[model samples]
Target chain A: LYPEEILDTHWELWKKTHRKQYNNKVDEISRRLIWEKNLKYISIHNLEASLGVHTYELAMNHLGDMTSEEVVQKMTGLKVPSRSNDTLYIPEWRAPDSVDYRKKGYVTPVKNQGQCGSSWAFSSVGALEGQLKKKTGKLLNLSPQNLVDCVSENDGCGGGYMTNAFQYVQKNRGIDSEDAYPYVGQEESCMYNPTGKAAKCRGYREIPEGNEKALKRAVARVGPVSVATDASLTSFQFYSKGVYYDESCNSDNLNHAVLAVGYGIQKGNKHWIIKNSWGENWGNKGYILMARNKNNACGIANLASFPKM
Target chain B: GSHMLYPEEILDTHWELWKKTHRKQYNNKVDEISRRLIWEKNLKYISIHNLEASLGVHTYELAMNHLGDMTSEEVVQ
Candidate 1:
């Protein structure tokens, strides 16, 4: 191998080399994905893939000075309600591979910045969408651009993540309307109350990294759960298709955010169903599949919690 | 006269090595990105530069010697 210096100089070329291989691996994982009988028309793998793209795009743009420790702090902003400490009984959903992985269920909808790198806002807002749906049967298509325009806690168009945005929602109780806080994917002045009719967010739940189990359960019981992970495993600039498997084994190649919807098994492999906000034009309708029972290299199965759900 | 460079074997070795040296980097990178997004910070600094370097090194290790009649530019390009 040439000196490490050269590798650094031509880093993009190196990424280009493995891009196809990574994508093909995702395709391989897709074949093993199966939707649950209870949930029909939902491809967990496809949804995950879609979410992966959103997270990946976000990470590619921002991610400055953000550390793993900070990620843990922000994700778990919404705490889970306290239960009886003395009697710790396993909830009915103990096993990872027990649930149906394939199901086209409605996850709360989310928006993208188009040209702006506002994926973090999308993921944070998307998580809230799931929480809202779980609490109330209302399936709201929350706007990432709205968060970008309103939340002062994050960098907005420059870059941001879901946890910080989650907190902003908590403090403000919610954001303004899309028309008021419209998004161009770039930083803009925080426009005040452009529409009085804009609904404010009630609250949000943040799933910390390494808490894959809790995150999954939250998504299943609630609507969707937002979390972060490495997204280099993906293979497209504007990827909208394919099944996503964290085959890196070491978990180093994955970085990004996503919304976990449900879980299931296929061909003896258990996996998670995730919904992505990358638009309906992308993979399996903007979804991706990941290993459920085991860690998908990036600890897609790790379980951590924020405040309370 | 032969399509000698094995893409499969090369990629396999590349990943195997990538796993050994950069697993933690990969984990940390994802965590960082996850955290930034969680905090609603713009994901502007999320570059996989280190990971790319690691993967490239691994790929070069497998293919550098195997370039044979082809140049690195030919293989990469």
Candidate 2:
């Protein structure tokens, strides 16, 4: 067993690595205790992971020290809409062997959402970013902050529905660029500018529930799709690397929204390359290879939609 | 945020709907009176501009937007 001294050194290294600095000793004490317990948990989980007992492995990332309540509260922010009866049908058309929008310059660099529960905005913006880039041949970062503040139907910084966010974007005519509006990670008064529209969305299309094949086609042809999944588990919260598959994931209780950018095979298991808004330090460079074609793992196919350009 | 408020009927609407729409409430009646006075004056300014638009004196009409409770100078910043 590793001693407490090794954990202390590891703790110090973790803080330095992630650039975490507490304001005072009291907060630091509490954080260090929490970090020590998490480090122990990671240590035990990684041991089994090394034995090939799991598909994914946990790591001491930036989110390691935060408790489940704190991290999941921020992470699982999608106010999911009900599954649609209208399904995307492309009969006789098949998904390619693989697809990756990042390789095609459709996705922007990874971004962090900070303290706000605005994943709905990010997912909506992310889906449209890929669509607009494919149509206009220009990659641009759209503003989630504009949706956070301006979309009155959404509860700013609390939670929101991506479909509602998309509807607001359509009714507003257009959305501002990230550089123009900027992300504060907090709610504020609406400061939208009509002249600074970076992109326009005509509307959105939904992939019907439990249809993984249709979602595959949507990703292959329509670029990144906004998707809701059950990310209310700690395994999902601290997921580090490898293909992620959890039996505990429920299809009906989707609470976290993300971007399904592509799909590929790993160890004979097909996996969906999902882009999260927790920055590069969270997952494998802000992305997760979630198991696909495995009975719709995590409801990735249940509540999926993409903005049309 | 582009919702419309009728110019003539802005003041006649009860505070219950306004409070819920704005998510606002005052602890004291005196304080509420102060804000209602500001709201009245603000709506009057909107009413004047909207009426002026019909006479071709202005380019557009003013609808009672969300910030109808605040003055031009208050919202300028």
Candidate 3:
């Protein structure tokens, strides 16, 4: 009797009514529709036990199913476009309307901070990583733990600014490898070493926080770029699966830090190619193109690096 | 990293579609075998017509190309 279809229709009806008011109460439920139940599975530390557990149910009282391989396929089947390596499309990033705080130029990818709220560390390291790869063609796996334990200028894993992290790496060379100091996603005892294999950091040019266009052009000529941003998903936690058209969810409540690999326009919206450290299976293969490179979303898209490299 | 993670069926279908579009890129003996075996099978089955079938086939073809076997080549070098 097409019970599932009927249930979906009713749910959509309910969401439409509640979403109109932008009520915080129903925000959780609204975001649930963004991903099909099957594809919402995650297994990264604290994220594993409640894999595919929707924020809706976590926030509201909606029932959800467990995530499985088959379910992921069924839910995203033919809906999401396949990844194309050859024909990547990146949109032009512009300068901020307010402050000119963004740095321009290419950046590189960084390993995620994992369970630690060390996104700031990732963003700082990412810019140097890209510049290093561009100048020397070396794919160095920089250490985030070093940023967490060694850099004494800011809060440990909880939070820190990208610019400050960049300065820390510049002053103290670069980071070590995961092997020298493996990532447990938490604070640990500092084992400082001037000659540790994983204890080296390179720096690059420093760009402001809001100048994104200069960054885009630099990346086009150079290579990958890195930028820090807030990755909070509260407003659109139960986001509907569609082209993100609103500016409300673009920036302002950023909570996560990730690397920007490429950018392009899709369905008219300017998007950035963000490579996440959440493994290759999560969020469009550990990546998702954030919508509209305008506002602070675009402002945070600037580049920062050291002068040596 | 189980084989389950790859979901071989998807790879198989993805390979088939790739082979059809890139059939001309195949080289010699392996190409010949691929044409007769994989290519013929794919065309005969009309697997590309089905989205799932095409995905698995394309993935298989991509694997061949990656392993440097002309028989499994999907893109022109």
Candidate 4:
């Protein structure tokens, strides 16, 4: 059970005002359902106990309506790219003492995706934004709604791949600004016009599957890379803080797409500073510190790719 | 107690009191009202912040902060 203050605040924040009574039987049932789910997640990972139950309740109550499987299926449209022997260049890659793109002014502030399965769009736009900053020395908020509405290769709000998004940008010559085409968090008809482009990328490169070293190199050398991971578990749904490592998560079953912004150590635990598409109220202000260097934990390195501007 | 309350001032004071006590409830109501105004009533794209500003109430700020500690009854009083 959470404190009355915590419960009251979350209830109001989530706009739960249709009901009159707060501490009634219905309230108890809702609280119990969320609490039981949180306990199950905690049992799966030892690190979860350290996270506050209040955060879990907030996610469970307000995040979205779709199941994790539905969200992942719609979000991950990226099929693994064909690997050639020539593409496999093993560089002696080393992550610096710490690397955070946010600190370097290359990253944009986190934005909410609402209830749509638009994580792929957010992730792709994030990578593109980073590349634009790196290439042109300007941080531009590119329109994710443009991808959601315009891209022909993928379904808008239904789901798509980051690779296809990059391909769309390359062929179309550029993407629009967020100011020109703002996000509505729902599937809408494509309003893409070539004249109002905000940024453009030449192409994209994929890090080899299951290669953690290559991913580290990509994040350090490139700005931010689009990644897919097994985000179907309850632990991921309510992940508040600390290095997230769920044993039940498999690399082959990647369902959610995110941007790998940076990596570093915390309390002797290595972690990937991943930017999520959920609102800022979620884990660590719309970011999750995932377990790093443990044989591709959560399938992070499996489907990683970034734009070339 | 002969002081008369002007219509605009009375509405503003009502909102101020409503915001102070039922912070979260008022926000939810305002958000709902905003959606209805935009979608149902065919009002132009007006943000919640704009609406709050128009009403001369900081309902958004109150709800965003820790004002949820107060009950609805306490807020009205």
Output the number of the lDDT-best candidate: 2
Stretches of candidate 4 exceeding 4 Å from the true structure? A1-61, A64-81, A84-94, A193-202, B1-77
Per-candidate iRMSD = 21.9, 13.3, 17.9, 18.2
TM-score of each: 0.47, 0.73, 0.47, 0.65
The order of the candidates by lDDT, greatest first, is: 2, 4, 3, 1
lDDT of 3 by residue, A186-206 (tens): 777677854233424333444
Q: Return the candidate ranking by TM-score, descending.
A: 2, 4, 1, 3
TM for chain B in all models?
Answer: 0.20, 0.70, 0.25, 0.21
TM-score of 2: 0.73
Give lDDT for model 4: 0.67
Model 1 Cα lDDT, one tens digit per residue, A47-151: 554575222221121111123333333321221112233212122455344443223335544343443546566666656655554443345566667777766
How far off is residue A23 in model 3, in Å? 31
**Residue lDDT tens for model 4, B1-77:** 88532224334454455445554343586563443222321112224544764553321111122332333345358
DockQ result, candidate 1: 0.01
Q: Whose TM-score is higher: candidate 1's or candidate 2's? A: 2
How well does candidate 1 match the true structure, expressed as C-alpha RMSD? 27.1
Candidate lDDT scores, in order, read 0.44, 0.79, 0.45, 0.67
What DockQ does each prediction reach against the true complex? Answer: 0.01, 0.01, 0.02, 0.01
Which tens-of-lDDT digit does each residue in A49-153 have in candidate 2?
889877888777887768977876875578754334433434346668999999999999888988788888899889978977775457889999999998877
The alpha-carbon lDDT assigned to residue B29 of candidate 4 equals 62
